[PDB]
């Protein structure tokens, strides 16, 4: 909720997540499963960034939306969503009867974001999703919401301080949403303020640079599997807007 949290029945969808969590328990494994995805995009680069910048709440899609306003986890990869990329990300899971849920089309790494978020977002050419497999957000029977850059531009333009956050970075700009084409993949994944039914994780700078730090450990083992992406870089932008690079590896 977080008064959702105990005390309710647990959605299925929520439960099928909760079963992936146990499964894939460490936080280091979110950082690989997310590097995979670009490799198998075709991307070239990855970057990580962690950012302290908290968005303003006025103009938002609904008041329920604030918590999700403040520090992200942000991916950077330089492949762009296909149609059939978009169609499997907002699959979190399949009912292929009336079965237990499977995994969907986009396969079982990307819900490893769960452990930091309840609400990822993904903003990849003339489209921005964001997925709420609790279901209270957008409809009670919808699981995300999506926006084209082009056919809700008016929409996108009210909602200035939802919005915000996809501009600034990566060298997405204000000319990224006129135009209606970011030439890349952006992942936000704003971090929890309290317990969800998805997880009691709560991560801060500290719990962040300990994974940076776990992937340091076995970055130049990583690079050895990856024949496409051959650069990955981690970042922080602090609360008043400084940015550093942590580490950068490179592979050939």
């Given at each position: 909720?977080?008064?959702?949290?105990?005390?309710?029945?647990?959605?299925?969808?929520?439960?099928?997540?909760?079963?992936?969590?146990?499964?894939?328990?460490?936080?280091?494994?979110?950082?690989k499963?997310?590097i995979?995805?670009?490799?198998d995009?075709?991307?070239t680069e990855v970057?990580?960034?962690?950012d302290e910048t908290?968005?303003?709440?006025?103009?938002?899609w609904?008041?329920?939306?604030?918590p999700?306003?403040?520090?992200?986890?942000?991916?950077?990869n330089?492949?762009?969503?296909?149609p059939e990329?978009?169609?499997?990300?907002?699959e979190?899971?399949?009912?292929?009867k009336?079965?237990?849920?499977?995994?969907?089309?986009?396969?079982i790494?990307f819900?490893?974001?769960?452990?930091?978020?309840?609400?990822?977002?993904?903003?990849?050419?003339?489209?921005?999703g964001?997925?709420?497999?609790?279901?209270?957000?957008?409809?009670p029977?919808?699981?995300?919401?999506?926006?084209?850059?082009?056919?809700?531009?008016?929409?996108?333009?009210?909602?200035?301080?939802?919005?915000?956050?996809?501009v600034?970075?990566?060298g997405?700009?204000?000319?990224t949403?006129?135009?209606?084409?970011?030439?890349?993949?952006?992942?936000?994944?704003?971090?929890?303020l309290?317990?969800?039914?998805?997880?009691?994780?709560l991560?801060?700078?500290?719990?962040?640079?300990?994974?940076f730090?776990?992937?340091?450990?076995?970055?130049?083992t990583?690079?050895?599997?990856?024949?496409s992406?051959?650069?990955?870089?981690?970042?922080?932008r602090?609360?008043?807007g400084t940015?550093?690079?942590?580490?950068?590896?490179?592979?050939?």
């Amino acid at each position: 909720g977080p008064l959702g949290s105990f005390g309710q029945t647990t959605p299925p969808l929520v439960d099928f997540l909760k079963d992936i969590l146990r499964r894939y328990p460490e936080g280091g494994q979110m950082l690989k499963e997310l590097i995979q995805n670009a490799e198998d995009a075709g991307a070239t680069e990855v970057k990580f960034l962690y950012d302290e910048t908290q968005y303003g709440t006025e103009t938002l899609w609904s008041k329920d939306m604030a918590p999700y306003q403040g520090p992200a986890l942000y991916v950077y990869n330089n492949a762009v969503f296909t149609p059939e990329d978009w169609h499997g990300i907002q699959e979190i899971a399949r009912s292929r009867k009336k079965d237990p849920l499977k995994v969907g089309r986009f396969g079982i790494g990307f819900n490893s974001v769960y452990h930091i978020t309840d609400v990822p977002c993904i903003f990849s050419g003339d489209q921005i999703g964001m997925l709420d497999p609790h279901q209270t957000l957008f409809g009670p029977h919808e699981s995300g919401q999506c926006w084209n850059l082009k056919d809700d531009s008016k929409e996108i333009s009210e909602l200035s301080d939802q919005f915000a956050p996809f501009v600034g970075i990566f060298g997405s700009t204000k000319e990224t949403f006129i135009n209606g084409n970011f030439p890349g993949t952006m992942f936000r994944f704003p971090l929890r303020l309290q317990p969800s039914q998805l997880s009691s994780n709560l991560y801060n700078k500290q719990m962040v640079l300990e994974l940076f730090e776990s992937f340091r450990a076995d970055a130049d083992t990583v690079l050895m599997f990856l024949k496409s992406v051959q650069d990955v870089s981690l970042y922080v932008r602090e609360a008043d807007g400084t940015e550093k690079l942590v580490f950068r590896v490179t592979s050939s």
